[PDB]
Design a protein around this ligand. Structure first.
Ligand SMILES: [Cl-]
Lengths: 138, 138, 138
């Protein structure tokens, strides 16, 4: 699924040419999905304002089929936040990320819908079961 | 309701001047709603990347009050996809469309909310019943 | 939470320099949240078309943690609408606002998630109870 969208007022000319590629590789591992279907939409130098002022501020969204829940959400947000403060030089008291759960049958990749089984993170549970066996009875 | 949003890295200068009007008329019929309330937001030459590369790639969204479900979703996605490959010259293994169901009482067109009855596709069922009668007992 | 996003084809050069600050202060009071965490993303001179024509048209979204419901939604929409007609010189039969309810544990502000209690508007009920007592038994 994944679609990481970053709206910031930070001007593109102040953005490391390798930011979208770093974020791409970070969220590919984070959401445990193929790198081939990971979008990163940078909206740099956006006419965005937060709190009525115009400092380094960011509003990011993560669209994902499954993977998203309170425990993982917070983890990802922290990582995205840390990656914004250091590379976009924003703040952390000026960053809001919204995680958007996407129904599998409401999302069309390559002339087909998604598997509802992945929306229920069933591929991870089955990995959980696999790794269990290995180092719980070889 | 309808709001078709297309984020592509394809430069506006390579976009048929009649693309937004074609897509507009396609999705007006598809979602069975007035053409007057159909938005098409083209975000051409967007700083969007998919898979860490920068080929012809697309992330479209369809915001609709009702109409949206697994069977119609897939149909629309296919049509939108076909309309992107030929007019935006993207790919099909580089297109992801997200269908977003919109609550009728969470969407304000012209100083009023929407009818919850349309969110439940009750105008189509009633059309279904009408056409039934016609060619099932004149 | 709040994130007010305005996509209009109205050119930035025709937008009062104080529009985003007016809308910011309006929706800060409306959604009863700190002004510090209110985003306004203006997408002026957007390649957006509605009805297949290119008049003054607007598609706004309100992302909020709680606050949003049929009675308040309509109120806000009316106010936003009135603020678009007069300052963006759009129409009112050319404005659609979508209110998006945001799960508190699916939204990360400043290295933490949001309080689920605010998503249930429990801070307002408690204010309701407080003010009740005052002018119902001093
Ligand atoms: Cl959404």
């Amino acid at each position: 699924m994944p679609v990481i969208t970053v709206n910031t007022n930070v001007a593109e000319k102040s953005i490391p040419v390798f930011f979208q590629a770093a974020l791409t590789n970070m969220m590919t591992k984070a959401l445990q999905k193929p790198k081939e279907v990971m979008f990163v939409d940078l909206r740099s130098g956006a006419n965005i304002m937060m709190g009525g002022d115009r400092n380094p501020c960011v509003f990011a969204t993560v669209e994902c089929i499954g993977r998203l829940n309170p425990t993982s959400n917070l983890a990802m947000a922290r990582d995205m936040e840390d990656m914004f403060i250091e590379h976009l030089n924003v703040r952390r008291e000026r960053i809001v990320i919204r995680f958007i759960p996407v129904p599998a049958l409401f999302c069309s990749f390559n002339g087909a819908l998604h598997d509802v089984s992945i929306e229920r993170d069933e591929d991870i549970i089955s990995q959980a079961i696999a790794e269990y066996l290995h180092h719980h009875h070889h």
